[PDB]
Amino acid sequence: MQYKLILNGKTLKGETTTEAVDAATAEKVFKQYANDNGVXGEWTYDDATKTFTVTE
Structure with missing residues (x-):
């Protein structure tokens, strides 16, 4: 349930983590x-x- x-x-440039039960929840x-x-x-x-990777 962990997402990076x-x-x-x-x-x-960096990397964070969160614990979410749904990919859309994590993405949100x-x-x-990010915003x-x-x-x-x-x-x-x-x-x-x-x-998830963000390329600005």
Whole structure:
């Protein structure tokens, strides 16, 4: 139930984590987080390692 976020912004590179029971819930949380950090970017999703990647 853990999901990662890989931030590749023009001035913001990093990775965060959250615990969510649904991929859309996790995506929404990460999108909110990204937006608060100024990002949103092109969003890619890997379901093998449960990671969302943002390419600004």
